[PDB]
């Protein structure tokens, strides 16, 4: 078995090299465009590690967003930009574990500020199937953009 720690914001002492998820794009973002977007303060990246280590084994990202028309009024949302898991954890099913943490996170978020839904763009249909198996619904924004509506806590 693999035992993992609770999802936590990416630091600079986190071990990012051994992470191998299957899509080089999503392993490259973690190596390159993760720390950078965070000091810039756009997206926030949450990572999980192997127990008693700092070797990252999975991660997700979170930025705010908006929907408006071309001339309430902007609809306040939250983009789940990346969700990936290392190839050495398979049937452990740590993806659903990360999407739980993310959704719960955004729901707490929405108890601080108005947030009407989470959005995500499905890469392949397997993304879409994962994301539709867990509440996401096809939207009108884009054909691969699915939304998960947010309801107030309590």
């Amino acid at each position: 078995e693999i035992n993992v720690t609770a999802p936590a914001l990416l630091t600079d002492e986190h071990i990012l090299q051994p992470f191998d998820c299957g899509n080089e794009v999503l392993s490259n973002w973690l190596r390159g465009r993760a720390m950078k977007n965070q000091m810039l303060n756009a997206s926030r990246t949450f990572v999980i590690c192997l127990e008693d280590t700092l070797r990252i084994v999975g991660y997700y990202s979170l930025a705010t967003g908006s929907v408006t028309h071309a001339e309430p009024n902007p609809v306040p949302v939250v983009l789940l930009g990346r969700l990936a898991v290392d190839v050495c954890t398979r049937g452990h099913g740590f993806g659903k574990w990360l999407l739980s943490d993310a959704i719960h996170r955004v729901v707490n978020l929405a108890d601080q500020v108005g947030i009407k839904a989470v959005m995500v763009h499905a890469i392949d249909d397997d993304a879409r199937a994962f994301y539709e198996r867990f509440g996401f619904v096809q939207s009108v924004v884009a054909p691969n953009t699915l939304f998960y509506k947010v309801l107030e806590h309590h």
Partner: protein, 39 residues
């Protein structure tokens, strides 16, 4: 992408489908059941 700008008709369709009652209730239950064991 972080700011979806939509024509008037896409905007109303997005709005109505968002003020509509929640859908895919089945998965949301499945997701809300995933109790993870973090350490």
């Amino acid at each position: 992408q972080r700011l979806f700008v939509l024509d008037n008709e896409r905007y109303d369709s997005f709005i109505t489908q968002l003020e509509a009652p929640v859908q895919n209730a089945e998965g949301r239950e499945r997701l809300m059941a995933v109790k993870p064991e973090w350490k």
